[PDB]
Structure formats: C-alpha cells, structure tokens
Design a binder for this molecule. Structure first.
Ligand SMILES: NCCCN(CC#Cc1nc2c(N)ncnc2n1[C@@H]1O[C@H](CNC(=O)NCc2ccccc2)[C@@H](O)[C@H]1O)C[C@H]1O[C@@H](n2cnc3c(N)ncnc32)[C@H](O)[C@@H]1O
Ligand SMILES: NCCCN(CC#Cc1nc2c(N)ncnc2n1[C@@H]1O[C@H](CNC(=O)NCc2ccccc2)[C@@H](O)[C@H]1O)C[C@H]1O[C@@H](n2cnc3c(N)ncnc32)[C@H](O)[C@@H]1O
Ligand SMILES: NCCCN(CC#Cc1nc2c(N)ncnc2n1[C@@H]1O[C@H](CNC(=O)NCc2ccccc2)[C@@H](O)[C@H]1O)C[C@H]1O[C@@H](n2cnc3c(N)ncnc32)[C@H](O)[C@@H]1O
Ligand SMILES: NCCCN(CC#Cc1nc2c(N)ncnc2n1[C@@H]1O[C@H](CNC(=O)NCc2ccccc2)[C@@H](O)[C@H]1O)C[C@H]1O[C@@H](n2cnc3c(N)ncnc32)[C@H](O)[C@@H]1O
Lengths: 261, 261, 261, 261
C-alpha cells in the first residue's frame, strides 16, 4: 500500500531508489513517507538503523526491508539485482512478517527519557573513570569499573556485542545481553567478566557511584547525559517487523558474514 | 510423600543424612529410593549431578533439593543449618516447583544412544586432531578444528561454559549454548569464535571429517565413542524440577558464587 | 643527598610526608624539588605516575620510591609503617637500583611531539569510527577498525593492558605490547586479534585512513591531537630507576595484587 | 657440505626431494643423514618439527631450512618453485644464520627426563581433574584448576599459544609464555587468567596437588607420565639455527599467515 524508500545517498543507492519507485508506479502502490506501511532501506546497516529510528513511533504498522548496495548487511540482506523481484512481490503482498526483539533504555535525572535500540545501547564516562553499580531486579550485583558497558538486542549480538566477546543469540530469543568493556579486576575490584543474558521482564539498572555524567549511545546516536541518577535496561514490549519473501536463516546470515560468502 | 537422600559419603554428609531421616520419621514421610517424589542431595554440585542422573527416568515425578556441606553450590543451594527447617517445610508440602531446561545429546553410529545433561555435553578427540563439521538445522555452518566443543544448558552456563568464555544465561531461557575449546584460526581455517546461543527446536549436528572416534562427556560422565557418524544437540523437552521454599534468585546465586558471599 | 616527596594530598599522605621530612632532617639530606636525586611518592600508582612525569627530564639522575597509603600499588610498593626504616636506609644510601623499560610515542602532524610512558599510550578516535593502518618496521601489517589500540610497557602490562587481554611481562624484558580494543572482524575486515609483543628497535606506526583527529593518552594524560599524520611507538632508550632496599619480586607483586595478600 | 632432506612422504614432497638431491649432485655436496650440517624439511610445520627433533642433539652444528608444499608454514617458509634457487644458494654457502629460542622441560619422578620444544610443552591430566601449584622462582604463585597449561617458545606463540589467547612474541625475545586452558575462577579458586611472559633464567615449576599422573606434550609428541613430582620450565640455553637467504620478516610471516596472502 503506502511505502517509502530511504537511500544511503551515493549514486548507486539513489538510482536504485528511483528505479524501484518507477517500478512501483506500475502497481497499486503509493509513495508516502509520513505513514508508510513498507519501509525500504537502500544502503548498509547504518542506513537501515536510521530508517528504523526514523519510524520508531509506528513500528507496529510497518514492515521493513533492507537492500545492501555494498557488502552483505545483517539487516539489509537483499541484493540490488533482486530489486525488480522485490518490487513485484511487495506489490502483490501476502508476505509473511518476522519480528525481532528490541531493547528499551530509560535514563532518569534529577525527568525521564526513553530510547529504543535495534542493535545496542552503551554507557561510557564523560572523560574520567567509569564506575557504576549494577543492579539486577533490585539486587546489587557488582560495582563495575572499566571503560563501559554494552547492552545488546539479539540481532545486535553480531555487532558491537560480538567485538566485546558476547555470544551470538538467535533473534527468536526475547532477551538482552550485557557485555563488559575492559573491566579492572584485582584484589579489591571484582566484576563477573562473563557476558550476561537476561530474559524478558528482568530490569538491569546502572547507578552512578561518583560522577553522574555519562556518554550514552543508542545504535548510531551518542549523547552526553548530565546529572544521571539511573540507567535502566529491559527487553522492550515493542518489536521490529520485517517483510520476509524467502528463507534466509539467521545462522546462514551469520555464516555468510563471518565465515565465508 | 516418598523421598530419598543421597550423600557425598564423608562423615559430615552421612550424619546430616541420618539426622534428616530421623527428623522425617516424625511426619507422614516414607523413605523410598525406587520411586521417590523428593530427592535430597547432600554434598556438592557433583553429588547433585549424580542424583539427577540416578533418577533421570522419573524427572517429571521428582522435585530435587540440594544441600551443600562444603562451599555454596549452584544446585546444592541450601546450608546444613537449615536442614531441620527443610524437613519441616518438606513434610508439610505445598511447595512451589521451578523448572530448568535440559540438553539432549544423540550419538549415532553405523544404532543410536541418547543422553540428558543438566550442565553440558562436550566432544573431544580420542587423541589426534579434532575436526568436525558443524551443521545447524541442516545448514553447514563451519568446519571446527581445535581441542573440542561444549554445549551447555542455561544452568550449566556458570560451569565449564563460563571457563570457556560463554555467556551466563538465566535458566528461564529455554536454550543451549555452544562454546569453542582452543580453535585454530588462520588463512585457511575459520571458525566463528563467539559462543552461539540456540533456541528450542534448533538442532546442532557435529559430523566427523576424518577420524570417527570421540571422547564425549555428559556432565561428569566421559565415554569414548567409536565409529561415530553424528552427534546431535537440541534443547530437551524434559525439564528438571526443584522444590523451592524461599527466594534465592539466580543472579544473586551468581553474585554469591563469583563476586562475594 | 637531594630528595623530594610528593603527596596524594589527603591527610594521611601529607602527614606521612611531613614526618619523613622531619626524620630526614636528622641526616645529611637536603630537600630539593628542582634537582632531587631521590623522589618519594606517597599515595597510589596515580601519584607515582605524576611523580615520574614531573621529573621525566632527569630520569637518569633520579631513583624513585613509592609508598602506598591505600591498597598495594605496583609502583608504590612500600607500606607506611616502613617509612622510618625507609628514611634510615635512604639516608645511609648504598642502595641498589633497578631499571624498568619505558615507551616512546612520537606524534607527527602537518611538527612533532614526543612523549614518554611508564604504563602505556593509547589511541582512540575523536568521536566517529577509529580506523588506522598498522605499519611494523615499514611493513603494512593490518588495517585496524575498532575502539582503539593500547601500547604498554612491561610494568604497564598489569594495568590497562591486562584488562584488554594482554600478557603480563616481566619488566626485565625490553619490549612493548600492543593490544586491541574491540576490533571488528568479519569477511571484509581482519585484524590479528592477539596481543603483539615487540622488541627494542622495532617501530610500530599508526597511520590514519580517513579521519586525522585522535584522542591520545599517555599514562593518565589524555589529549585531543588534530591533523595527525602518524603515531610512532618504540621502546625508549631511557629507563626509570627505582631504589631497591629489599627483595619484592615482580611475580610476588603480581601474586599479592591479583591472587591474594 | 653434508646435508639431508626429510619428506612429508606424499608424492609431491618425495619428488621435490629427489629433484633437489639430483640438483645437489652437481656441487660439492654430500648426502649424510647421520651428521648433516644442513637439514631441509619438505612438507609442512609438522614435518619441520620432526626434523628438528630428529636432530635435536646436534642443534649447534645444523642450519635448518623448511619448504612448504602445502600452505605457507611458519617454519617451512620457502615455496617449491624456489627449490632450484635454494639448491644453488645452499651449495655456494656464505649464508647467514638466524637463531630462535627454545624451551626446556624437566620432568622429575620418584629420576629425571628433559625435553626440548620448538613450539610448546603442555600439561593435562590423565583423565580426572587437573590441579597443580604454580611456583615461579620458588615463590608459590597460584593453584591452577582447569584443563591444563601451555608453555610456548616465541616462535611457538603463533601456534597452540595463539589459540589460547596468548600474545604473539617476536622470536628475538628470549622468553617463554604460559597460557591457561579453561581455568575455573570463583570465590574459592583464583588464577591470574592473563598469559605470563618469562625471561631467561626464570624457572616455572608445576607441582601436583593430588593426582600425580599427567599427559605431557612436547610439540607433536604426547606421553603419559606417571608418579610426577615436578614439571620445570625454563628458556633453554640451546637455540635452533635457520639458514637465511632473503628477508622474510617475522611480522610479515604473521601477516601472510593470519591476515592475508
Ligand atoms: N557508520 C555509522 C554507523 C555505524 N554502525 C552501523 C552498523 C552496523 C551493524 N549492525 C550489525 C549487526 N546487527 N550485526 C552485524 N553487523 C552489523 N553491523 C555492521 O557494522 C559495520 C558498521 N559499524 C561500524 O563500523 N561501527 C564503528 C563505529 C564506531 C564509532 C562510531 C561510528 C561507527 C558494518 O560492517 C555493518 O554491516 C553503528 C553500529 O556500529 C557498531 N559498532 C560500534 N563500535 C563497534 C566496535 N568497536 N566493534 C564493532 N561494532 C561496533 C554498533 O553495533 C553500532 O550500532
Ligand atoms: N568432582 C567430579 C565432578 C566435577 N564436576 C561437578 C560440578 C559442578 C558444577 N556445576 C556448576 C554449575 N552449574 N554452575 C556453577 N558451578 C558449578 N559447578 C562447580 O564446579 C566445581 C566442580 N567441577 C570441577 O572441578 N570440574 C573439573 C573436572 C575436570 C575433569 C574431570 C572432573 C572434574 C565445583 O566448584 C562445583 O560447585 C563436573 C563439572 O565440572 C565442570 N568442569 C569440567 N571441566 C571444567 C573446567 N575446565 N572449568 C570449569 N568447570 C569445569 C563441568 O561443568 C562438569 O559438569
Ligand atoms: N586516578 C587517575 C589515574 C588513574 N590511573 C593510575 C594508575 C594505575 C596503575 N598502574 C598499574 C600497573 N602498572 N600495574 C597494575 N595496576 C596498576 N594501576 C592501578 O590501576 C588503578 C587506577 N587506574 C584506574 O582506575 N584507571 C581508570 C581510569 C579511566 C579513565 C580515566 C582515569 C582512570 C589503581 O588500582 C592502580 O593501583 C591511570 C591508569 O589507569 C589505567 N587504566 C585506564 N583505563 C583502564 C581500564 N579500563 N582498565 C584498567 N586499567 C585502566 C591505565 O593503565 C592508566 O595508566
Ligand atoms: N599433524 C601433526 C602435527 C600437528 N602440529 C604441527 C604444527 C604446527 C604449527 N606450528 C606453528 C607455529 N609455530 N606458528 C604458526 N602455525 C603453526 N603451525 C600450524 O598448525 C597446524 C598444525 N597443527 C594442528 O593442526 N594441530 C592440531 C592437533 C591436535 C592434536 C594432535 C595433533 C594435532 C598447521 O596449520 C601448521 O602450519 C603440532 C602443533 O599443533 C599445535 N596445536 C595443537 N593443538 C592446537 C590447537 N587446539 N589450536 C592450535 N594449534 C594447536 C601445537 O602448537 C603443536 O605443536
């Protein structure tokens, strides 16, 4: 029905976008970037991430599709050569939807801000040492000293989380994963070390010890937050929906990206 | 109703066992180690593991309880001082049950053997190099060369899995986790490296490349298997049930064991 | 002969400093913080690091001593109770000196700046992605994409380097060690992963790929450098000298700090 | 002068060997596999390792050369196409020698056995738990519980040591590196975790706690030792010598093997 297309903005992606719009013009399809029902991202995973955040207030009404004009992306998992086939199948419709879990981040001050992540949310200090108390379902778990912390969605586990030693999780698992960035461990300072995987309805709370200023990232976006009293992580009730047109299993996607393609 | 008690076999555990039996004699409780409904393990996690495997054919009819006479165990999570309180609460009954997921291992030859794991199942070679093809839901994922592989239950993630870099997973997540033991990675040999977390109904199959003899462990038990054609891992449909009498959250149990107690 | 004493600045360290000065007044010892021959640091390792950098232009004329008024430090390895014994032994003299290797960092622009490190020097980006070409003795070794890189002295290996997975090296080895911070590794991006240990006279050069702005740290000090053409690492020809009065072996120091004391 | 050639034993390596012998027949070169001065290994690193151990009692009289008929090896670093060039340059002589450090392993019982390693020596248990006390220069450093331990030469650091998280060390550094295999770390059990790098004249001693039977490997060779009282590691005074005919820097060799070739 209603659809829009975002572009990475290079020549290859802009022209693929115009060609798909022309191809869409031959069906009962209406270009609408205010209330689209299909969002096509042409570029890479960064382009797809921006498309998700552009429309994160209408996630239940939108099915996303990614086309990678560079190397294979984990979200942009369609090749440009299949664009005409994609146009045809999209126009007809009757496609199945698959849903991936998302991460909710709440930042409290001394007022509240909430953010939704498709990959992950990270916390680092403003410049000095990073020290937070990690509280799991109101239980004090550890005092973390180090570079920072990363809380990843399942589909995010192949991104920053992977570089930090985290496990790769199949996205059908409604969970979030917390990994450490360079923790100090000696006689007096102790962290768990291992990645931690949390189910739905578990709340991980980060509470400042001394400094209350933190650089908080949500996917690409990174903002300095001041006078922070708490950072709360939990699996969101909201999910992102993908239009699926053929089988591209997650573990094959992992294989193609990290082992060989 | 019917109950039995296993002991580590040292003086401390044998006498605690006899005292609980005497205390149980004052209620409508019958000692039966053929068809018990409550299985009390007195000792450590190894003692608890043997109790589980002693009765793994009646898991749906049994609630397990562990008493640790040494350091705190992840399964034997009751102190000996609470034994009298445990007797009293057990006798009355009306206790809630909590269930943890289990791992099913199938070993095929050229005939079939199946095993149930509460912690993990590992595969190593008989002596020479270990090389297996890793197949996920019939998709060839990687050729693994190294010391071996470990497939862990959620409650097993704090055991061997943790020492191999795996993530700690809350046991409410029905999953299994595959970690690598010292993989070779160079130009010609590529593994994923990261731990992999699999949901229910995903089948991980290990298939020999040259040598077909493997040392396979299931919890404590380790057996040399010969003429192996395939090793299949999946989350079991069977679950282990614990009698719960108070709140001892998993993440607090993790905290008490690895951070401080 | 000539000596000075730096203090962490809390009450405990200031008063210990005044007491040692009073005790030194009973010997042929002259307080001189312009050209001291003995530099006593009272506080922690951060205090010792500042003392080293305060006098890094007279390293060949100075023997350093650290007193830890908090937990045991790797550089401040004397307890406050031994201060009177230290005064007496220092005044007499005839102490042996031990030398630790240092790291030289050269930053080139489009002009040159050089820095000396006792712990390590790290490179991170100004905000966006960090991408550098790593060149070893003029040989292009890898293109590094990730959070950053850390080059550690031997005595620094128990500090940031340790938290990044680096090896602990005995300080008698004239070397530097390069560790990765969260590198991306997929089909198209490849780093070595492993820590790299370099002997004297090997030059590791970091060369920008796109962005030329970098946040460069040397021990505690962190500075944003702009218009960087190259960052060069090599083991310095200069060494830091410690006054030794009893045996405190490095591996015992490692044991006391990380295993138990 | 005197020379011999070992072969992997496949058709490619046997015929290359015969062709080099025929080519050597045109110079003042004598085939002697009793007291050779040049040892040519044709095959892979395993073939080279066997050549080293075949002649480990005449290391000071022998210069080794490796030809890799498969993928590039770290010791067999010459291609078969250069065999004729190698024959010519070898016959003339006047080649430079480069030396790599070696590892000495002493096994004491209740009698003594000593072994020389070019890659590494590892210790594992006979079947049950592996527990040893790690003693560094007579100082008790840690009690290690886990799968085992690996002590690597510098040139060995790119082999098993690399798969265990160890650092890659340039072979001009006279050192040995100790890495852990899956150590248990909790409240009651503590190891250092990090790889440890030891200079010449440091002695690392492994002492049994309960079981005295250990599976000890030296390069390819693996032997069950019984009634072990101590395992002692130190950098050997003996070195292996390579004939060098052109520049093939170690870090380029690392690059070609792990990054790209
Ligand atoms: N260019 C602006 C936006 C950059 N990123 C977009 C992305 C992405 C992504 N998501 C992936 C996924 N779920 N599974 C596997 N692949 C996934 N990709 C892949 O990652 C690559 C791109 N990303 C990248 O170079 N970032 C470095 C960076 C650092 C600082 C600022 C900006 C960029 C590409 O190949 C794509 O295919 C944003 C995402 O970087 C991830 N990120 C951040 N820091 C690191 C790190 N140190 N190591 C690994 N990933 C990191 C993080 O997770 C974030 O959401
Ligand atoms: N004694 C015969 C039986 C030994 N093990 C019993 C157990 C256990 C256990 N389960 C735990 C859990 N889910 N979460 C946290 N804690 C858990 N425990 C804790 O682990 C300790 C005991 N186990 C141990 O020293 N094993 C070494 C070993 C090697 C070879 C043969 C026999 C023993 C104790 O403190 C207990 O509290 C069996 C279990 O060893 C685990 N295991 C095996 N190898 C390693 C390793 N290299 N690193 C870490 N764990 C290992 C594995 O996972 C197995 O199921
Ligand atoms: N307070 C201002 C100055 C802080 N640091 C002083 C120091 C130190 C030190 N040197 C040590 C050594 N050679 N071997 C073992 N112990 C050694 N110490 C020990 O490290 C602790 C102190 N340092 C620390 O919390 N820093 C966190 C930090 C981050 C950002 C800004 C400021 C501080 C103390 O216990 C002492 O005993 C400076 C040194 O931090 C090291 N550092 C930096 N980031 C990390 C990290 N993520 N993980 C581990 N170390 C880190 C680095 O290496 C630097 O030179
Ligand atoms: N085939 C009989 C003999 C096998 N090995 C010969 C070798 C070698 C070698 N030395 C290398 C070096 N210094 N730097 C880089 N490359 C180096 N190679 C490379 O390693 C590959 C070969 N080796 C291998 O598959 N071994 C697995 C194995 C396990 C159990 C029994 C037999 C073999 C090849 O590509 C070659 O190019 C012996 C050496 O295996 C090393 N080894 C042992 N276990 C592991 C492991 N889990 N992970 C990584 N290496 C391991 C160890 O270190 C030993 O000395």
């Amino acid at each position: 029905m209603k659809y829009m297309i975002t572009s990475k903005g290079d020549e290859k992606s802009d022209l693929l976008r115009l060609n798909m719009i022309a191809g869409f013009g031959e069906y009962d399809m209406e270009y609408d970037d205010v209330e689209p029902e299909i969002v096509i991202s042409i570029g890479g995973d960064g382009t797809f991430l921006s498309a998700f955040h552009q429309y994160e207030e209408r996630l239940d009404e939108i099915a996303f599709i990614g086309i990678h004009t560079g190397h294979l992306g984990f979200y942009a998992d369609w090749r440009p050569a299949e664009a005409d086939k994609l146009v045809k199948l999209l126009a007809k419709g009757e496609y199945q939807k698959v849903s991936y879990p998302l991460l909710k981040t709440t930042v409290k001050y001394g007022k509240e801000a909430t953010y939704l992540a498709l990959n992950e949310s990270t916390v680092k200090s403003s410049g000095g040492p990073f020290v937070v108390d990690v509280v799991i379902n109101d239980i004090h778990f550890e005092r973390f000293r180090g570079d920072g912390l990363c809380m990843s969605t399942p589909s995010g586990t192949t991104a920053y989380n992977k570089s930090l030693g985290g496990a790769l999780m199949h996205p059908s698992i409604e969970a979030m994963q917390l990994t450490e960035m360079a923790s100090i461990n000696n006689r007096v300072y102790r962290t768990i070390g291992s990645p931690l995987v949390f189910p739905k309805h578990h709340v991980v709370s980060l509470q400042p010890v001394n400094d209350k200023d933190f650089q908080i990232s949500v996917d690409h976006l990174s903002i300095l937050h001041r006078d922070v009293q708490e950072i709360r992580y939990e699996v969101s009730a909201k999910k992102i929906h993908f239009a699926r047109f053929r089988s591209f299993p997650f573990w094959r996607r992992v294989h193609d990206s990290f082992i060989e393609d």
